[PDB]
Scaffold this active site. Structure first.
Site, PDB file in Angstrom:
ATOM      1  CG  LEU J  43      -2.066  -0.991   1.242  1.00 51.27           C
ATOM      2  CD1 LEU J  43      -2.667  -1.055   2.624  1.00 51.27           C
ATOM      3  CD2 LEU J  43      -3.111  -0.586   0.225  1.00 51.27           C
ATOM      4  CG  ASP J  44       0.192   5.261  -2.216  1.00 51.07           C
ATOM      5  OD1 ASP J  44      -0.954   5.059  -1.773  1.00 51.07           O
ATOM      6  OD2 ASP J  44       0.577   6.387  -2.588  1.00 51.07           O
TER       7      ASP J  44
END
Ligand code: 3PE
Ligand code: 3PE
Ligand code: 3PE
Ligand code: 3PE
Ligand code: 3PE
Ligand code: PLC
Ligand code: PLC
Ligand code: PLC
Ligand code: EHZ
Lengths: 77, 45, 64, 53, 80, 105, 65, 69, 257, 88, 132
Positions: J43-44
């Site tokens: 997940l960024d």
């Protein structure tokens, strides 16, 4: 005895200041505006109602000597 | 992706939350109100 | 009450009862302050009701 | 208790008392509304005065 | 029905019946039996039906009389 | 302070800016299917300035950004009941535990 | 039947206020509801007499001013 | 659940879900007292109440004005 | 005065019932939320609490046949029934509020019973009803919110009923003109706008919800943020009177005392 | 009965569905309590903000911005919500 | 945006009392750790001389809109109502009475309304029916 109140240092400076505001008060042209309003405007302000109406208000059982309700209805037509 | 939570908010429009099921009988017993009234209609005769 | 003063005894005690009930959870800040607001604004109304009652005694001599 | 992941909410099955108790109160309201409306609708809207029979 | 305003009660009659002050008019006579019906009938909607519609029909005539007594007043405004 | 792009401190500030960016839009739009669009639109707006290493344009965009959140701020924000500002906040808070200290008064 | 309609809630209010610690919680809620219930019944009895049978009541306790 | 320090805090109402061990014993002890009080209110109430429209008949009032006229 | 007293008795039942039922909605949900924007689709889950609100809401909307109709409509009928300038102006203010009563009542029920769910799904698998003690009063008030207005109408609002405890001067008896001289349109107008306005709003809330996102039209955002803050009267009272009133006490304390 | 409290067993299940349902998690990325939202799940930085916002929306809470920047593993999210009064 | 409450001074010179610009404690973040958590005040923080008007117990300060903006809108709301009322009064658009006002016999119940003699009459009488 056991110091049940956890004395706060900055509370003391607050209470010390709030009990000694009169020392630092200076009678500038702004304190002179608030003194005049609170001591010579308002007291003279109520000094006229208290005398322009003193002995001029006979209200005890002030009867009615004037009709209230309209008797003849005039339509706008 | 457009609406990245398409697989999480699906139930907000499915099953008991479908358009019919939500409005299903929102008027409680409207036909029952008619139902007793319909009895009283022909009882009135 | 059969006279306006007995009405005032009840009238005040709606505020005292409400002040306790509105500020019932006295550990909640928004609720302790809300009781004071409900008590004080009613007293503003009660301040005028007292004045009206006085003019009833002045003009009529009784509050029955 | 357990929480089966990724399952929709099924149509609820509330206790049979609550559904009948709810509808009966609602049924009475509609029955009362219709019972009154069958006897006073012209009077409500002024079409017929109450003393016209 | 009540096709015209009934006999007006005398002032001595209104006092003895405790009639409300505003309901002392041409329709006062019909009100008197209606109140007795309400007391034993507990003011119920279904009990006092005949008298109530008899009373309420009188008031419409009074209202219509006033309308008939408005254009009479209104004509005089058109005199000048 | 000095907005340093790609730094951890700027990561938090964008994290805060985006946290309030969705909450404020959540309060105005109370249907989930319509709310999902607005989050994507804003997320489609945090990508336009995602790759910008110029501080000179960063302040001006960051000045504008707060103005947008301040303009569109909801006067009646949704709060969880037990969180501060809600409806159950400080309701029947359990009494503070401390031993009694007797005194001769 | 007048004095019962007025001061019964006051008696119920005081019981839970001062004797509440001695009569528990559940047994203290229902006594208060009991005191009000007496007043509800007494009001309808008065309502029957006052509105329908045109009887009025007055209990003068003592002078105040 | 939790600890609320009800050991020394002894208000008239107990506080924090307080229920005494002998709560059944005192429960009727108040019902007996309360029921007697209501009976007192019904005995006092009926003895002293009156109808203000029936104390003076209409004939007596119809002459009071003629005295004050 | 007879109309107001009668409407006071009626309103004590179809407004007490609303709070208790609303107090049961908040109790039923395990998150104990009070904001209506965290509700939705509760009709099937708590149908008894919904039914009490719905009957109360219709009575509050003065639907014919219920207690609200026998008390609320006649008061509004007589606003036009006095045939004065002041009476006419207040008639529209009543008529707006007669319709508004029908508009926010639908909004409250739709936002909490006919809307897509907003709360976490874990809540719904625990969203149930309450015990019998909490239910008994609401049913008793529910019946009184339908029939009570009809049974008690003639005691207070009857023609010529002896109620000298409330004085109505003979020149002020305009009850005759109210019940006879009103056109048919007025007798149904609050209902026609109430029923039409509610359904029109009900469609917009359901199929055309894009309009009611007021953050677009700055005029409609400023309007929404104005009535949502209650005509700013809370802000004017706190910041400008209590804040000013306290400052007068500070001036006396500093420049006088 | 009402909700039988909220134990970590039920807590962890509700977090998993949020991660399972997010299509921005890179394909694969087996979801275990020890997995980090950056490496294991991919997940960024902006994705993690959304995930916690759904996490705080799922439990009807409001994690402060100061503390929500410190939740970095799934076990941290499980451990956080457990010791919270307002968790339902 | 976040204006301070009114009647708060900018410069105070109270001898040796420390000079610190006023901070309204009502707007402090509830989430941060505080020693006086209810009042959101850390221990031993210096207090403004007029701190009684800034701490929590002071009247709540609504800082959503400018005060002059509030007066503008609140006055605007009743300006429309005054406009609606004033327009009608000018032309007499409100309906006229459909009938004569309610009439009564016995000189309009003059005696029944406490009129002793025929001199008073109109002092107490209601509308009088002229079709006796
Ligand atoms: C009219 C002339 C003005 C009269 C004002 C009286 C002088 C000042 C007295 C107020 C002193 C301040 C005070 O009483 O304590 C502050 C208290 C705070 O209340 P608040 O913060 O709003 O509660 C929010 C809860 N969430 O504030 C209060 O609760 C005080 C409640 C109001 C007291 C009466 C206010 C005047 C009412 C008449 C206004 C007329 C407008 C039309
Ligand atoms: C209450 C006791 C019932 C009254 C005695 C029976 C009766 O006289 O009629 C039943 C009554 C109907 O009343 P209603 O329809 O309003 O008018 C009379 C229609 N011929 O029925 C009712 O009024 C309903 C009574 C409430 C239940
Ligand atoms: C907080 C700690 C507790 C301590 C304080 C508790 C509250 C105090 C309660 C009692 C107050 C003291 C007053 C009672 C003394 C009796 C007063 C009295 O003298 O009554 C005068 C009355 C008529 O006067 P008269 O005709 O001259 O005959 C007397 C000649 N000796 O002569 C009589 O016929 C006597 C009438 C006696 C009536 C019984 C007393 C009733 C008191 C309770 C009701 C109070 C009034 C209602 C207020 C309730 C709220 C509305
Ligand atoms: C601790 C508190 C200390 C209080 C000290 C003062 C107590 C009262 C003073 C002595 C009164 C003695 C007494 O009761 O005399 C009997 C009296 C009879 O006087 P009488 O004039 O003939 O009655 C007709 C009046 N209309 O009868 C009366 O006048 C009593 C009339 C009172 C009726 C209203 C009572 C108000 C309710 C009080 C509730 C709290 C007290 C509980 C009382 C138990 C019974 C319910
Ligand atoms: C109480 C009886 C009437 C007294 C009226 C007093 C009015 C008054 O003195 O207003 C002064 C006050 C602002 O005065 P001040 O604080 O000196 O301004 C300094 C700005 N740097 O202004 C105020 O505090 C507002 C008072 C409004 C009174 C209405
Ligand atoms: C806590 C603070 C304490 C303050 C105490 C206040 C006391 C009341 C003051 C009333 C003053 C007053 O009545 O003033 C007015 C008087 C009267 O003269 P006039 O105005 O021309 O009368 C007008 C008469 N017509 C109108 C009939 C023509 O004037 C004085 O000679 C004021 C002298 C008093 C101050 C020295
Ligand atoms: C017509 C006039 C009738 C007057 C008589 C009314 C009877 C009711 C008395 C019950 C008293 C009571 O309950 O006070 C005692 C209770 C005890 O605490 P608790 O709330 O049980 O919780 C207990 C847990 N603590 C310890 C955390 C609080 O409250 C209090 O200490 C709250 C403080 C405010 C009390 C205000 C009393 C006001 C009395 C009336 C003022 C005129
Ligand atoms: C506050 C603003 C509210 C809206 C503006 C009202 C303007 C207006 O025109 O109001 C004028 C009104 C009406 O009085 P009238 O026209 O003499 O009534 C005619 C006299 N009858 C009725 C005997 C025939 O009186 C008021 O102001 C009332 C007070 C308003 C609330 C304070
Ligand atoms: C309803 C209200 C409507 C209106 C609502 C309010 C919306 C506000 C306007 C929307 C866009 C506006 O420009 C806000 C902005 O610029 S903020 C992005 C700032 N970007 C930088 O300054 C460069 C540094 N960028 C990074 O460091 C990484 O991209 C990242 C931040 C992801 C770190 O995360 P991780 O380490 O990968």
């Amino acid at each position: 005895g056991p110091h049940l109140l956890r004395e706060d240092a900055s509370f003391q400076r607050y209470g010390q200041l709030r009990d000694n505001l009169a020392t630092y008060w200076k009678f500038n042209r702004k304190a002179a505006r608030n003194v005049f309003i609170f001591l010579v405007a308002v007291p003279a302000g109520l000094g006229y109602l208290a005398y322009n109406y003193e002995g001029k208000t006979p209200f005890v059982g002030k009867r009615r000597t004037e009709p209230i309700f309209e008797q003849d209805y005039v339509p706008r037509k | 992706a457009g609406n990245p939570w398409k697989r999480r908010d699906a139930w907000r429009s499915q099953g008991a939350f479908t358009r019919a099921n939500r409005f299903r009988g929102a008027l409680p017993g409207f036909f029952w109100g008619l139902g007793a009234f319909g009895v009283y209609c022909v009882y009135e005769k | 009450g059969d006279n306006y003063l007995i009405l005032f005894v009840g009238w005040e005690f709606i505020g005292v009862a409400s002040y306790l009930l509105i500020s019932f959870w006295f550990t909640r800040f928004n609720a302790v302050k809300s009781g004071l607001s409900a008590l004080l604004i009613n007293r503003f109304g009660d301040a005028l009701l007292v004045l009206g009652l006085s003019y009833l005694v002045l003009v009529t001599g009784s509050v029955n | 208790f357990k929480y089966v992941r990724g399952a929709i909410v099924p149509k609820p099955k509330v206790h049979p008392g609550y559904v009948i108790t709810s509808k009966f109160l609602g049924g009475l309201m509609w029955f009362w509304i219709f019972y009154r409306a069958k006897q006073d609708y012209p009077v409500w809207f002024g079409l017929k005065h109450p003393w016209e029979h | 029905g009540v096709s015209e305003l009934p006999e007006l009660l005398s002032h001595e009659e209104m006092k003895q019946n405790k009639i409300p002050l505003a309901y002392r008019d041409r329709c006062a006579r019909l009100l008197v039996p209606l109140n007795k019906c309400r007391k034993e009938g507990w003011y119920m909607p279904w009990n006092c039906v005949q008298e109530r519609h008899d009373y309420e029909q009188c008031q419409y005539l009074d209202f219509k009389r006033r309308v008939k007594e408005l254009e009479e007043i209104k004509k005089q405004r058109d005199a000048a | 302070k000095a907005v340093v792009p790609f730094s951890e401190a700027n990561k938090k500030y964008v994290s805060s800016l985006y946290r309030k960016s969705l909450r404020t839009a959540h309060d105005w739009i109370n249907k989930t299917e319509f709310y999902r669009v607005k989050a994507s639109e804003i997320r489609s707006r945090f990508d336009a300035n995602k790759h910008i290493n110029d501080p000179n344009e960063l302040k001006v965009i960051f000045k504008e950004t707060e103005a947008l959140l301040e303009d569109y701020a909801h006067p009646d924000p949704i709060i969880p009941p037990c969180r501060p500002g809600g409806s159950k906040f400080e309701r029947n808070i359990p009494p503070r535990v401390e031993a009694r200290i007797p005194i001769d008064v | 039947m007048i004095l019962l309609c007025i001061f019964t809630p006051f008696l119920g209010s005081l019981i839970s206020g001062f004797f509440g610690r001695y009569i528990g919680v559940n047994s203290s809620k229902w006594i208060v509801c009991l005191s009000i219930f007496v007043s509800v019944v007494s009001t309808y009895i008065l309502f029957i007499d006052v509105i329908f049978n045109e009887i009025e009541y007055t209990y003068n306790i003592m002078n105040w001013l | 659940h939790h600890i609320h320090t009800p050991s020394y805090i002894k208000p008239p109402t107990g506080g924090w879900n307080f229920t005494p061990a002998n709560w059944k014993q005192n429960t009727v002890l108040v019902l007996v007292g309360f029921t007697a009080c209501c009976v007192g209110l019904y005995k006092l109430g009926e003895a002293g109440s009156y109808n203000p429209k029936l104390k003076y008949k209409e004939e007596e009032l119809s002459r009071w004005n003629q005295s004050a006229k | 005065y007879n109309l107001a007293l009668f409407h006071l008795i009626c309103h004590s039942f179809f407004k007490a019932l609303l709070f208790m039922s609303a107090g049961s909605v908040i109790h039923s949900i395990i998150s104990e939320y009070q904001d209506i924007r965290m509700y939705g689709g509760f009709r099937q889950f708590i149908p008894l609490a919904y039914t009490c609100i719905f009957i109360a809401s219709l009575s509050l909307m003065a639907i014919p046949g219920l207690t609200g109709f026998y008390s609320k409509d006649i008061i509004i009928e007589s606003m036009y029934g006095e045939y004065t300038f002041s009476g006419f102006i207040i008639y529209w203010f009543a008529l707006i509020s007669a319709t508004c009563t029908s508009l926010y009542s639908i909004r409250l029920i739709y936002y909490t019973f006919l809307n897509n769910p907003n709360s976490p799904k874990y809540i719904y698998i625990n969203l149930k009803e309450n015990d019998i003690v909490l239910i008994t009063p609401m049913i008793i008030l529910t019946i009184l919110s339908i029939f009570g207005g009809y049974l008690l109408r003639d005691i207070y609002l009857g023609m010529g009923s002896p109620f000298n405890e409330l004085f109505i001067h003979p020149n002020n008896l305009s009850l005759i003109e109210t019940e006879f001289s009103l056109p048919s349109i007025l007798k149904v107008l609050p209902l026609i706008t109430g029923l039409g306005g509610g359904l029109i709003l009900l469609l917009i809330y359901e199929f055309n919800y894009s309009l009611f996102l007021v953050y677009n039209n700055k005029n409609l955002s400023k309007l929404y943020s104005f009535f949502n803050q209650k005509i700013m009267f809370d802000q004017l009272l706190n910041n400008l009177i209590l804040r000013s009133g306290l400052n007068i006490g500070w001036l006396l304390n500093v420049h006088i005392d | 009965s009402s909700t039988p409290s909220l134990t970590k067993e039920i807590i962890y299940d509700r977090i998993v569905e949020i991660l399972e349902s997010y299509d921005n998690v890179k394909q694969g990325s087996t979801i275990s309590p020890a997995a980090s939202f950056s490496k294991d799940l991919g997940l960024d930085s902006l994705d993690t903000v959304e995930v916690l916002l759904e996490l705080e929306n799922e439990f009807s809470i409001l994690i402060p911005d100061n503390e929500a920047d410190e939740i970095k593993t799934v076990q941290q999210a499980v451990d956080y919500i457990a010791a919270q009064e307002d968790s339902i | 945006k976040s204006f301070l409450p009114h009647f708060i001074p900018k410069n105070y010179s109270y001898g040796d009392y420390p000079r610190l610009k006023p901070e309204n404690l009502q707007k402090r973040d509830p989430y941060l750790k505080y020693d006086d958590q209810a009042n959101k005040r850390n221990f031993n923080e210096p207090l403004h001389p007029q701190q009684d008007d800034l701490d929590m117990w002071a009247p709540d300060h609504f800082d959503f809109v400018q005060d002059s903006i509030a007066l503008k809108w609140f006055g605007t709301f009743f300006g429309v109502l005054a406009v609606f009322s004033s327009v009608i009064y000018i032309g007499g658009l409100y309906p006229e009475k459909p009938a004569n006002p309610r009439n009564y016999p016995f000189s309009g119940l003059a005696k029944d309304l406490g009129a002793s003699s025929e001199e008073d009459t109109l002092l107490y009488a209601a509308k009088i029916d002229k079709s006796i």
